[PDB]
Structures are given as structure tokens and as C-alpha cells.
């Protein structure tokens, strides 16, 4: 990790709340489909990385995530990210795709501060639950480990660094449009 | 089954698939015998084994191989499965090996996959046959990067079996001295639908896919298409403008593209402007399951699960020499648009999976569809490109080819 | 299979039913090929699309359809899969549509699934038939709201198929001048068991299911059952006193149901007392997987899916002019005991589910299930009552009935 | 929403444990069979709602949810709740029914207040995990939406409203029969 | 199929299997009904149903089970299936019980599943035949301790089909005068597998498992191998030292075992040192689903479900009169290494799993796999044990015999 | 249960994070393969539980668990942990076996003190993600019922008692290798 070899600790606990309620905030929006109040939760120089992770024998459980150089599920820009919202609010506009349906459980939280005021490093859990047409089901779980930093709007925070570690060899879905 | 009514399935001159290729099991148990165990199937790219013993898992069809590079510096392509009692022999993605050893009782194996010691031998086996008894090999071939295998010894060579296909997929493997390196990583998602659904297809609007489009800008086109002569090929191509550009790959990568050093030069080893810098967005399929879109540089494998389920493996590739910065934007972008995330791609999943779900039906089943699209409209002595090439690029002669190829393949016991 | 072995599935006089028919794939795909291709299909109700150019998808055995009001309000039910590559033309569960675009290709489509559009026919087709290429229609035909289809161009009309069951179906759909309006939302869960285990059946015991019941009261009876001349549907019900009023339905719903004008006057529209309000609960089922309970008042389609699932679409039909309070308890009620989440139908699901799973096994497929109960005990001319009527209502009449028009529908080329 | 365009916030933290503590206790009466227990949890005024959902296109997205003179999966008055205890009560006494093994995992709890002392409004999150006979399975999630009414009682408060959003268009088990 | 080309499925002399006996869909339903449904299956141990009307549910094969101790003491083994429409008829997986009601519609069993009472049959059945609709009863046998039924009224006698195995299963089974109870509680898990991997096999070196053994440690070996005549049974064990004390069962297991009263004393009834106390681990198989390992002393049924899917169900046998914290320790070391969690079979379990995943392949069920091992090493006389015996323990001739039992039952229509 | 017929309750809310932090953080090394540092976590006198589960009739619920001289899940000392331990370290140095992907969502954390300074009686939720080689994946729920102790370890706590109530009849999966 860094920052996660040793035992957070201890906070807050209404820093604690803080964050989780930030979190399920979130998710309120992200299962909302309230998109649009979403993306502006993401810091201009958000970094949102998912690498693609490999099934490897143990001694090199190691080599199991793609470094930064290489092909991810996810590398966004706050440029690249700026152009999916686009893609969303294009869809609900002129479009005939059905809406799909989402939860977000967030759990284990923990809390390690860091250099500047302001920035707050952080490991959660996950489970997201998305079925959407009649029947299509699929599970994801893993863990996002973000960069916060304080912020003067009303929700607080912003992201400025997002990596998310999918619990997922090959990517049991069929597609990943919606956002951890 | 039978010889006369699987040619039934499919009426070329006529445009009419019968639904059924799409659903049927004993079918799909057919393309299994009789087109991917006598086909050139795609396991890779060169660059994800650069070192001695350096191996990578896959499929050809549903059997599991290992790939792995020897110290000759070859590429040795076996069956994934210990013959003692079928165990898996290597059991990572990737990894570098000195040797393989079957881990449920002992049988071990050398780089590649040779029988060479079973413990005790001594003891049992009175005279055991080391080389029978070592995994099925698969014939390697290599395409200016692009690892290939097939199983039958009596397959023809991969180049006549390209025949001129190898013209249009220089377009991405040969534009440069220094051959072209694949950017490590391969996407892996799952996709129910029928593997040729994918390869047909995909995103064959050579009219929506819009909403991704949109993506790119910060806010009725010329081109042609090409039909393989033999082995059910095809590829489809633009001339000149944004969509590359802007849209897509965005700025630099099409600057990289059309104009500039690495795309005049260098491209001109093609031996024509326009055949390396007027190009933009190009399809290519190479029968049966090898995808990649030259100019985006996405490539993919389909594999197929039943004949209702495909995994679609999925890498990125670059000019070897590129700068940093540009081989850096291949990655961001491709993955921005051709991935499972993609803003196109996450689309063309969606669908397919529809189309699939509605063959459930007994009515869904019974009519065929209709690929009658843009019949007649080749020449076949092109001043430029070889083959079967039609002028007006929305048509389905490369798509009526595939299928044809398919019928030729699924009908033939023997080589036609 | 073979028209002779199918036959010998279910022994009618001796009452043997073969659980291989609940279990066997090919069983199964003639099913859908000589039941649900040549039956009239409960698709829904007419106030569910009230106004021209609304929708609701559901299905025909395993054939997506769009069932849409058309601007001579009309109902168009064609197959939901575009003909050019069978994508789903239409994607919600329900709404209004002004013209229908499959997303995959541009290939338009009116209000009724006629191809009226494809982009640039100029370029490419030369000439297409836009008729040929629309989807497959059903034909569409209503009974007293219900709606229904049959793909059969040769099917018998309606009326006819119905015969004399509409006798038992105006208990619930005509009983007032104004009709019959159903309750907007429709309820589905999917239930892993044959179809012709839940339409048989359900809830048989025309002995507990008791836990239901005392959910109702706040702490042996008389009746008949009628079987169908000809196309296998049936119906069985009481006469006089609690289970509708206490248990099911409560106070309120029986007050309508039996006494005051509601009941009297309009439901003496059926020229019949006893007939309007000495009536209680019914079961009635129409061939194939159409079923409701008047006097409760949800209806169900059974969607087949394997032989091995079935989906449950249900929802609830009130008298239309019927008092809001009154129209209000149908809607807590039935929801409260026929749902999935229903304090009685919650049971029925558990059940069948074992019951399929058992027949897994190779013994519990061998003998065959006893349907012997009460032979011979209808007459076939009561004064009041059309068809075929037993007097004790405890029997298995319908339900032999319902197997063997199946049998008949099975075994046929062509119409009887 | 109403109560939820815009974020909680902040409580508590007294109030948010006291809440999340009410849910664990409430999940552990549900997955532990103890139901005589749980349904006095219920304030006599107790609506109980699920409504039915629908796969619709993007720009309908409004029109998902079953509105309240249209049939839902659940409505419930207090008395058709006691009705419903009578019938887990009876299954219990005389029948040969087998017993059914749940898990209700709790959490993106957010609380707003309304108007009386007295009564909080609610947002959590859901998973519910239901295995029962050898092999069955089915998952659920989706958002509870309560009013919470405080209470003399040892549990503290009482559910008045609760309103249950699946994330499931299609209901994927075979039955509801047990409690979100 | 075909009697003649099943038989190619197998070679004995000469030692190779075909792959596809493991996957092939209707060769499966073929086992069910010549393999399950004629031979001795293993459904528990008597401990598990002391009391009268004591029962505990189970499989022979893919048919559900009821197992009930009767007023007699004896042991009534009946098809778990309502005969009316084939509900479960018990529901928990163990229990106590005066009769059976089916839940369904109300027939009532008694202890030994007799269909003795259905509501008015009054009213309904002119005479029903209530012993013709009782399920399917099964000849019920007991060994020792270990209950066993078989459907065919013809089978031979257990006793007979076990044949000279009962002299090997004595190992665990007869060593002391008060018999055997079975520790309570019976794990089970799923494994999709085939069948007869599990069965072969399980755990076959009879070279590493290696982590498992360094568990037990707080940091080439002799013994012999016995096939059956006649019905495909085997077993294969060690002579003096670790491996069973250090590693396995450690310390106290192995006193036991081997030295002192109880194993000296008590494990004379076998007449013979060696054969009681000089054991060490032991193998044992008994066809075609009966599995244990006297000295670690896990019993399992593998229950079949796909061709591709097995469930393990395992509990544990101890000496009925051996001292409580010996008991203890067989309880504890059982399931630290031979659960589905245990330090051993953890492993065996993900083996079989690819190995039935591999075989989703074309090529891979193309080839036979290799059992040659250590052939012609078969003296049937032993001085001390009868049968067939192996002096070299390293070999596959029990597999090769199992192999051959399956044949043999695979291709008769009769009993040969 | 004892100590859980009755409602918690209140603490903490010091204490409630508390505890929290140590399950996330227990799950943080499970996840991430840090066996090592997970075993010392264990009393010395740990007593890791899992009892078996069966599908009985509703009146008799009551018979569901294995009881303590009946075959486990599992039943282990300190000294067969160990040994486990030793099973997972071997395969990593010298074995080909490839490494498995685990998420343990941990939710509905309960706290009651007990005898001793020291000790405290837990109830927990569970949901456990398990995706290995390609596609593989199950996912099981429960309840842990852990008693905690004190300790002097920059961890703070000692798991003493673990008992892993599983909501599970027959084991879903084709082996248990992870650890709850
Ligand atoms: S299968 Fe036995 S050596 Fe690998
Ligand atoms: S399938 Fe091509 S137009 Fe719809
Ligand atoms: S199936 Fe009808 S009595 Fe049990
Ligand atoms: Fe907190």
C-alpha cells in the first residue's frame, strides 16, 4: 500500500462520519443516476484508475495489478471523465438505451491524513450490485482507495485521486459503464 | 446434422442467415472440429513474451493452451491439460518458467510442454511412450507480430491462408522499420451472445453508436471495403477527415497518423500516400476470430463459450518507435473508447446480448435475416487494393463472405 | 420423438401423467411449436395501453412481442427482433411511442412494426421488401378487456377456442354495464418448474395452504367444477359463505361481491342469481397459460422457460365503475394473498420448485403421477352451467382436460 | 426524494450510532428468526411500501416506480402486517415447512430530521442475502427509505413509514416471504 | 449410444480412458439408470438414526431419499416423492417423525413411506390402490455400521457385490467388539466435477499434497494395493511409521492406532498383527460412490449431479467404546484435514475442478488419458490378503478395476 | 445468544469506532494476503468455530448448529492455526497454485462488555466475496459471533473467540481455504 502497511490510526470519530457520510452521499447520487451532480465531486486533477488485474501463482501475487504504463479498465483524465458525463447526459437525452439499476454498499473506511491541510487518504470496501433488463445480474465487489481533499462546497470534498482494486480476474459483466 | 442442410443455413447469392448458426448446439460442436481445430486462431502478440520461458494462457476455441517463448527464442504452442489425468499444467495468466510441473501427481514437463519426467518410471510404466504422451502441440506462426496457431498438421500455410488479407492489416503491423509492440495488459469481459455475432460485426455501421461520438468533440462519408477471395476475411476503411481525429483518438494521434515524419515516411513503405496517411478508421476481421481496428490499434481474440457466450480478449498495439507521449495517447484513448469502459464498445455488448437473449424464442428462430445489403457492387482488379473491393463502404460482402467461408469450412471434411 | 410415444405420455381414461413431459428438452420444443405458435396468449389488459402509441412488452411462449394502441385504436402485437440482425426493437417494459428505431442499424418502424424506414435504400438494396422484412405479426383479438394472440393464421377465432368458457370468465370480466379496468402494474417473479405445473393446478385443493387463511380472521364444502369440450380449459368454484368474505377477500370485498346493488342489479347482467352472488371463490384456467380467480381478481400469464422455470406475470382487474375504497381493497388484498410476496401464493411457488428439482433423478422420472381423482362424475347438460360439469368439486376433471388437449394440440399437424 | 436533493447533514455522532444500532438490532431480529420481536417494532400507523419496478428508457426514468393507488409487491397497514405475523406464527406451531436462513447487511445510513421531537427520516443501503433447502439463493439489494419515531420502549424507536426500492425489475427469487 | 461403441469407451488391458465418459450428457443418464439404479449405494451410518422414527434425507443418485428407523429397528429407505404430483414428502434434512403428510394436497405416509391415508377417498377414488402409490421403496443392507441401498429387487445380495472387499473395510469398520458409531453432523460442499474423478482417485499418490503434511509437523515407502474380482471395488494402504502419526491424525491417533490395548487387544479380531496395528493410512473404494479412509476414518457419498458437478457429503466414524478424547481427536484432525476445509482435501477439490473445466474443449476430449500404470504386478493369492494384490502400492490396476466394474455395468442389460 | 436477547446496548462511540477499525483493518490483511500478520492476531487460547448448519423443519430451528462434540467447518486450536498458517506460507514459497481474490464486507458490529477489563462479546455481519482464476466466484454471508480482548499490540485486540454462524446449508462453494 503505503499508508496501509501499519494500523491507520485512530481519528476522528466526527472526521470518520465526515468521510462515510461523503461516501454514502456518493452512492446516493451514483444510484440516483443523478449523474450530473456526480462528476462534479471529482477534483480537476482527478486521476480514476482501475488496473486490470491477472491470476497469478503466489509467490508472485506481486505482479497480479497493471502498473501505470499499461493498458487499464480505467485511466481518466478529468478531461476524459468531462466527456463520459457527456456520453451519460447524451444518452438520456436523444436515445432509446434503458436505464440501469445500481447499489453501492460502502464499508470498511479508514482513514490516514496526509501531506496538506486538506487531503485525506483513504481504503473502503465495496460490493456493487447492478441489475438492470429483466434479469441481467452481476456482482462486483473490491476496494477504492481514494485521495479526498477538503472543499468549500456543500458536499465537502472532492476526488482527486481514485484507484479502484476490482476482486475480478477476467471482468464477469459484459460491460463496465457504470462508475465505482 | 448433415452435409446438404448445414449449406441450407446460409444463402449467399440471396442474402439470408438462417438464425439457427447462432443458437444450435450440435452446431456449435461442429465449429469446434471444423473451424477452429483447422483454423489460424489468434493467442496473442510477440511482445507479451519477449524472454526465454516466458509464458501467457489461452484459448484456441475451448481447448486452453500455454504459449510459451524457448530458448531458441521459438514459440511453443500446447495443449493446456497434464494426459495423465487431464489436470491443468500451467496455472497462471502469465509468468516466466524454467520448467512445467503437473502439480496433481508429479508428470513434468519442459518449456515446451515435452513429457520429460514422471517420477518412478523405474517402478510402473514398462517402457512409457514420453513423446505420445506429452500434450497436443499447435502449429505457431507469426504475422509482423501477431502470434497465430492451428492444430492440423494438413492446415495451409498462414500466409496463403491471409492470402492478400496481410495488404490490410500492414496497414497497422508494418508501418515502420521497427515493427510494433504490444502495450502489456489484455482486457478480458464476458459477452453472452455467439462468437460470430462479435466477429461479424462488430460496430458494422462500417446509423447511431452517437452518444460516443459526442464523448470526443468539447462542445455522408467516401471510402470502400474489401472481401477476402478465400478464407472469409474483410476489411472496411474511410478516406480523409475527423472522425479519427477528432471523436475518437483525438488531435495527436491523428496528427501522428496523417501527417508528419512517422506517417509520410515510414508509412511509405506501403508504396502510396492515402494507403498510409488518407486512411482513418478501418474495421479488418481475420476469419474466424481475430479483430483489430488499424488507426485506433485496438486487437481482439473472441472466444467462444456456448454457442451463446463469447470472452472477448482484447489488447492495445503501438509502433515500436512512436514517441512516449503518442504511444501514451494509444493507451488512454483506445481504452477510453474500445475497452469494456468504453464509450463506444460498452455499447456493442449491450446489444449482441439482446440479440442472443430473443433467439430463446421458437418464432425469434424461424425466419432468417436479412444481409442482402449493397449486393454486386465489386470490382475485382482495384488499381490499388487486391481482392474483392467494394466502392460504396455500407455494404455486407465482407460480412456475406464470412459467412460463406464458414459454410465452405463447416461443409468441407478434408481441404477444398 | 414420434406422434405414436408422444401419445402414450398421459393416459386419459385411467388417469396416468408421464412426468417426463414436465422435464424433457425436445418435449419442450415442440411445445412452443405446437402449443404456443398455435394458441390464443393472455398478452394483458386493455386499459394497460389506453391511449394510441402506447406500449407494453411481454411475451408469446418465448417470443418477445411489443403489444401497442394504434391511432384507430387498435392493438398491433408484432415479434420484438428487427430482421436485419434481430436486435430488440423495442427496449422499455412499457410507454408511449411515436414510431419505433432499432438502435443497432437506423431501420425504422411505425407504431405497428411496419419497416417503414431504412437510411440510404438509394445506395444499397435494390429494392427491398419492406413487408417481407417487417417483423412477424400476431393476430391480435380481445375478450371483455383481455387481450390476446395467436401467430396461427389458421387458428379457430377466439370465441370459437374460448367455446363455452366465456360463460365462466363473464363471472369476473362482465358483470357491469361498464366493464372491467385492470389496476395499473403488473407483478413478475420467476418460479423454477414447468409451466404446466403452475397452470394445472395452481392452488388444486379446489388439504391445508391453512396459515393463509388465519392471516384473514382476527382470532366441508358444496360446489362445482367444469371441464371445457373442447380446447382444455376449466374452471372451479363454491356457493355460499366465509373463505372469500373472511380469509381471502375480507368484509368489504364480499359485501360488493355478494349483497347490495353492485352485486345484485349490474351482476344480474349474467340472468343469474347464485351465478352474481351466491358465487365465492373460482380457479379457471384458459388454455394454455392464462389464469384468474374472480371474486379475488388477479390474473396471471405463465411464461415458459425452460422446460425446468416459468415466469409469473400477474396483475389485478377491478369493475371499473366499481367504488374507490372498493377498487382499493381489490388492490390491498390481492397483493396481500396472491403475490409473491402473498400470504398464499408465497406456498405455491416453495411447492412446484421442489417438484421440479425432484425430477432430476432417473426413479422419480420412471412412474407416472396419479390424476384419477373423481372419474366419471359429470353429466354434461346442467340446467344452469355450459360444458362438462362434476357436482362434487373435488376432482381432477379440468385438469385431465388440460392434459389432454394438450395431448391433442401435441400430436397434431394441422387443426382437429 | 424530498428530504435527499440535497446532502444530510451533519448529526450527530450520539444520534447516527443510536440509529445504525436500532438497524443491526433490527436485521439481527430478521435474520434470527425472532419475528414476534420484530413486528413490535412497527408504529401502529406502520406503511409498509415496495413498489414495483420498471425497465424504462432513460428520459422515463421517472416513471420506474409504481405510484400509490397502483399495485405494489408490498402496502401494508398494521393490520395486514399482524396478519402476517399470524402467518409466520402458524407455520411455525402446525406445519411441516422448513426454516429459512437470512442476512441483512445494513449500511449507507443517512439521517435527516423532520417536524415532531421525535421522528428522523432515513436513507440506508441494503444486501440481503437469503439461502435456504441444500442450494437456494438469491441476493437482493436496493434502499430503504424510513420514518423512524422515537419511543419509550427498550428498542427506542418504532418504523412508521418504510419505504423498500428494490434494485430488481423482474423479481429474481420465487417468493417475498420474508421482511426488508 | 450403443452397446458396442460404450465398450471402446475404455481399454483395459492396454490403459486408456476416454475423457468424454466424464462429460457426455446422455452417457451420464445411462450411469443413473445402469450404475445407480442397480447397485449399492451408501446413504449414511446407523448412529445417524438411532431412535425410532428417526430419519435423515439423502440421494441414490439423483433421486432423493428418505431414510427412517422403523418400530422394528429396521431401516425403510423410500422415494422422497409424493406420488400424486410429485411433491417432497420430507422436508428438513433430519428429524424425528410419527408419519409423513405431503404438504401438497394432504396424503398421509407412515414411518416406512406407505401411502395409508388420503382425504375422502369417500368422495374420490372408486377404490385407490394404496400400496401401487406409495413411492418407490429400495432394498435396504447394512455393513457393520454403513447403511446401503439399491432399487434393482434383482441385484445380488450386499454381501455377495461387496465380495472380499468386507475384509479390507474391517480395517476400520470391526476392529473392536461394540462396533462403530458415526460422530454427528455431516459436511457437505459442491464440486464441479465429474463423479467418477472423485471417486478414482480421490487423493491417488497412493508426488506432492506437500503443505498439507508440513501442517501437522511442528517444525520412498513400502506397502500394497488391492482390486476387487468382481464389482470394481479397491483399496491401498502403507506399512509402519510416520505419515499417519506426525502429519495426518498426529500423536494420540496413532498410539491408538497402533500400539496399546485397543489395538493390540480389539484389533485381533482380525487375526492378525500388521493387518491391525502395523496399517498406517489406507485408501478404499467402494463402487460406485462409497469412500474412506480407515486410520483418518472420513466416510463420503459422492452424490452426482451434472456429468459436471459432484456434492461430497462426508461425516466420521470412530470406535464406539474408544475413550472420549481419543473420540475428540478423531473429530478434530478429521476436519483439519479432510473437510472441505481440511489441510488435505482443500486441494483435491481445486484439481477436479479444472480438470472438468479443461474438458469444455474440443481437443481436449479428443485423446484418452493414461492409465498404464504399473501393469501385470498382481499376484490373487497373498499369503494374508484375498483378491487381487498389488506389491508395489504405486499403481492404477483399483482404478483400472473401476474403470472395468463401470463397463461392465455400463453394457449389461441383466446382470452378468 | 446470551448477551444478545437483549438489545446491546448503548456505548461507546470511542469504543464502537474502535472496535470497527480492528474488524477493517483484520479484513484489510485477509484481503491482502497478509496471512502472517492475521494469525497474530489469535489468543493464544483462540477457539476458531464454524459449526455445520441444517435445513430442519420451522419448530425445530432450535437444531440448526452443530453442536461442540459434533463435526465442524471448523474447530481449532492455536496450535492447528498454526498449522494452517504453515500450510498457506508453504504454498506461497514452494508450489504452483495460483493466488485467490477475497473481499470481506464487515457490517453489523454490536458490543457488549463482559467479565474482565478487557473483554468484550461482538456480533457482526458478514458478506464474503470470493472470485478466483477467471471466473470462479461465490459469495457467502453470517454472522461472526467474536469475543475480543485487550492487548498491547499496535493491532489493540486479540480475537480469543471466533464463531462463524454461516448462512449457508450445504457449503456452496467446492472448498473453504479462505478464513472468515
Ligand atoms: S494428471 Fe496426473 S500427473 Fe497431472
Ligand atoms: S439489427 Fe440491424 S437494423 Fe436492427
Ligand atoms: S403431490 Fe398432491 S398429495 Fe402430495
Ligand atoms: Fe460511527
Not at chain 1, 501531506?115 to 438492470?132: H, K, T
Not at chain 2, 489436470?87 to 496433481?104: P, V
Amino acid at each position: 500500500a503505503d499508508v496501509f502497511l501499519r494500523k491507520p490510526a485512530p481519528v476522528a470519530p466526527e472526521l470518520q462520519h465526515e468521510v462515510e457520510q461523503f461516501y454514502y452521499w456518493e452512492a446516493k447520487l451514483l444510484n440516483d443516476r443523478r449523474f450530473e451532480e456526480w462528476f462534479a465531486l471529482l477534483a480537476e486533477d482527478i486521476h480514476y484508475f482501475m488496473p486490470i488485474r491477472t491470476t497469478r501463482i503466489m509467490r508472485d501475487s506481486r505482479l497480479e495489478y497493471s502498473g501505470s504504463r499499461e493498458y487499464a479498465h480505467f485511466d481518466d483524465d478529468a478531461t476524459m471523465m468531462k466527456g463520459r458525463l457527456r456520453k451519460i447526459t447524451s444518452d438520456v437525452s436523444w436515445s432509446e438505451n434503458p436505464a440501469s439499476r445500481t447499489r453501492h454498499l460502502v464499508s470498511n473506511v479508514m482513514i490516514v491524513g496526509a501531506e496538506a491541510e486538506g487531503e485525506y487518504e483513504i481504503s473502503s470496501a465495496f460490493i456493487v450490485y447492478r441489475n438492470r433488463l429483466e434479469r441481467q445480474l452481476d456482482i462486483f465487489a473490491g476496494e477504492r482507495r481514494d485521495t479526498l481533499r477538503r472543499n468549500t462546497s456543500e458536499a465537502g470534498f472532492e476526488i482527486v485521486n481514485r484507484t479502484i482494486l476490482i476482486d475480478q480476474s477476467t471482468i464477469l459483466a459484459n460491460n463496465l459503464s457504470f462508475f465505482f | 446434422w448433415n452435409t446438404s442442410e448445414i449449406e441450407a443455413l446460409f444463402d449467399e447469392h440471396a442474402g439470408r442467415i438462417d438464425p439457427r448458426i447462432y443458437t444450435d448446439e450440435d452446431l456449435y460442436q461442429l465449429e469446434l472440429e471444423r473451424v477452429f481445430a483447422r483454423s489460424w486462431l489468434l493467442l496473442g502478440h510477440e511482445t507479451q513474451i519477449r524472454k526465454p520461458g516466458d509464458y501467457i494462457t489461452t484459448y484456441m476455441g475451448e481447448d486452453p493452451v500455454v504459449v510459451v517463448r524457448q530458448k531458441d527464442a521459438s514459440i511453443a504452442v500446447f495443449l493446456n491439460q497434464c494426459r495423465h489425468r487431464g489436470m491443468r499444467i500451467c496455472r497462471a495468466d502469465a509468468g516466466n518458467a524454467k520448467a512445467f510441473t503437473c502439480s496433481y501427481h508429479g508428470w513434468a514437463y519442459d518449456t515446451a510442454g515435452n513429457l520429460v519426467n514422471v517420477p518412478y518410471e523405474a517402478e510402473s510404466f514398462a517402457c512409457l511412450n514420453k513423446k505420445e504422451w506429452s500434450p497436443l502441440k499447435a502449429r505457431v506462426e507469426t504475422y509482423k507480430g501477431l502470434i497465430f496457431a492451428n492444430w492440423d498438421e494438413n492446415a495451409v500455410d498462414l500466409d496463403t491462408y491471409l492470402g492478400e488479407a496481410k495488404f490490410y492489416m500492414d496497414h497497422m503491423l508494418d508501418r515502420t522499420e521497427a515493427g510494433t509492440e504490444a502495450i502489456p495488459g489484455v482486457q478480458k469481459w464476458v459477452i453472452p451472445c455467439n462468437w460470430k455475432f462479435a466477429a461479424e460485426q462488430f460496430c458494422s455501421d462500417m446509423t447511431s453508436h452517437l452518444s460516443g461520438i459526442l464523448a470526443g468533440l468539447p462542445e455522408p462519408t467516401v471510402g470502400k471495403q474489401y472481401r477476402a477471395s478465400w478464407g472469409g476475411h474483410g476489411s472496411g476503411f474511410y478516406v480523409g477527415d475527423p472522425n479519427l481525429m477528432l471523436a475518437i483518438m483525438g488531435p495527436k494521434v491523428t496528427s501522428y497518423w496523417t501527417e508528419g515524419p512517422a506517417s509520410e515516411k515510414a508509412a511509405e513503405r506501403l508504396g502510396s500516400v492515402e494507403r498510409g496517411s488518407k486512411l482513418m478508421v478501418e474495421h479488418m476481421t481475420v476469419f474466424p476470430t481475430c479483430s483489430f481496428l488499424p488507426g485506433i490499434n485496438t486487437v481482439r481474440t473472441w472466444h467462444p463459450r456456448g454457442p451463446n457466450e463469447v470472452e472477448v480478449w482484447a489488447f492495445t498495439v503501438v509502433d515500436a518507435d512512436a514517441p512516449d507521449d503518442i504511444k501514451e495517447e494509444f493507451r488512454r484513448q483506445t481504452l477510453r473508447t474500445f475497452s469494456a469502459g468504453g464509450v463506444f464498445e460498452q455499447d456493442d455488448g449491450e446489444n449482441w446480448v439482446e440479440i442472443q437473449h430473443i433467439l430463446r424464442g421458437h418464432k425469434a428462430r424461424s425466419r432468417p435475416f436479412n444481409a442482402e445489403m449493397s449486393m454486386d457492387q465489386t470490382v475485382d482488379n482495384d488499381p490499388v487494393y487486391p481482392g474483392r473491393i467494394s466502392n460504396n463502404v455500407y455494404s455486407e460482402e465482407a460480412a456475406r463472405g464470412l459467412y460463406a467461408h464458414w459454410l465452405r469450412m463447416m461443409t468441407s471434411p478434408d481441404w477444398d
